[PDB]
Design an enzyme around this catalytic site. Sequence first.
Site, PDB file in Angstrom:
ATOM      1  N   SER A   7      32.166  75.020  49.181  1.00 18.00           N
ATOM      2  CA  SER A   7      33.372  74.228  49.384  1.00 18.00           C
ATOM      3  C   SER A   7      34.176  74.072  48.098  1.00 18.00           C
ATOM      4  O   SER A   7      35.242  73.461  48.098  1.00 18.00           O
ATOM      5  CB  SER A   7      33.019  72.853  49.954  1.00 18.00           C
ATOM      6  OG  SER A   7      32.333  72.973  51.186  1.00 18.00           O
TER       7      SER A   7
ATOM      8  N   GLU B 100      31.175  80.326  58.181  1.00 17.60           N
ATOM      9  CA  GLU B 100      30.390  81.510  57.822  1.00 17.60           C
ATOM     10  C   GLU B 100      30.170  81.708  56.326  1.00 17.60           C
ATOM     11  O   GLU B 100      29.231  82.400  55.924  1.00 17.60           O
ATOM     12  CB  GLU B 100      31.027  82.773  58.400  1.00 17.60           C
ATOM     13  CG  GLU B 100      30.812  82.947  59.902  1.00 17.60           C
ATOM     14  CD  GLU B 100      31.723  82.061  60.751  1.00 17.60           C
ATOM     15  OE1 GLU B 100      32.811  81.675  60.270  1.00 17.60           O
ATOM     16  OE2 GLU B 100      31.356  81.758  61.910  1.00 17.60           O
TER      17      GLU B 100
END
Length: 265
Positions: free
Chosen positions: A42, A142
């Site tokens: 992230s 993913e």
Amino acid sequence: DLADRFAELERRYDARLGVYVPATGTTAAIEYRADERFAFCSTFKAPLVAAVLHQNPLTHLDKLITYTSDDIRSISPVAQQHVQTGMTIGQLCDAAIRYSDGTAANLLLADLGGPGGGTAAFTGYLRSLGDTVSRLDAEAPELNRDPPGDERDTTTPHAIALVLQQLVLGNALPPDKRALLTDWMARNTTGAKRIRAGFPADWKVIDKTGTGDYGRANDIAVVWSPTGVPYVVAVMSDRAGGGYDAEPREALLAEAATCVAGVLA
């Protein structure tokens, strides 16, 4: 001796650790496994939001983006809330950074354009900053679930720290856009237990975190000493031997940050 302590944390936590702090006028670069690849997770959401800022007028932030309940593929603490309303590019930016919203990010990638649902345009933006190492191939979710040893969706502590340095401390973005990004990271809600925990409270810390399978935990931050001296700190880890379901060790990132603080102090 610094290498020995990172090596110990490694063993104490059954983890692989990667650390990088860019050199400054008075301190050498700090580096441990700084050039080995680690999953973005992230942490990309941060330079993504700068991609979106670079390529568009401020005005663009007000543009409303509409999506559906099926667009929500990953942890989206904010998106699912505003599906009826949708969100401006600004509210997407805010949530991709401050809450790590998987959908908010997925949207902003799309707002970049081109193949791979935005990811070619995004790696394009990293390239434009001198980073030839990093690559974002897939989109949420993913990209947090690539096998250890897979090139796709990875970066290095070295590469992300120089990027982050240009975004916040350098000239990558005009001042107006610069303070938007910086302010969004300063109010990040996901990092209290990582780098921010490893540094004395009187150091200012902004950051963006990343978490994934295989015990992946990342944190990238810009810190200010009590006297105002900034440094860029990139800390990345995975625990591949625990497999897919291995648990991320937040305390690893917090401790490595304490070692870093003592050396900068």
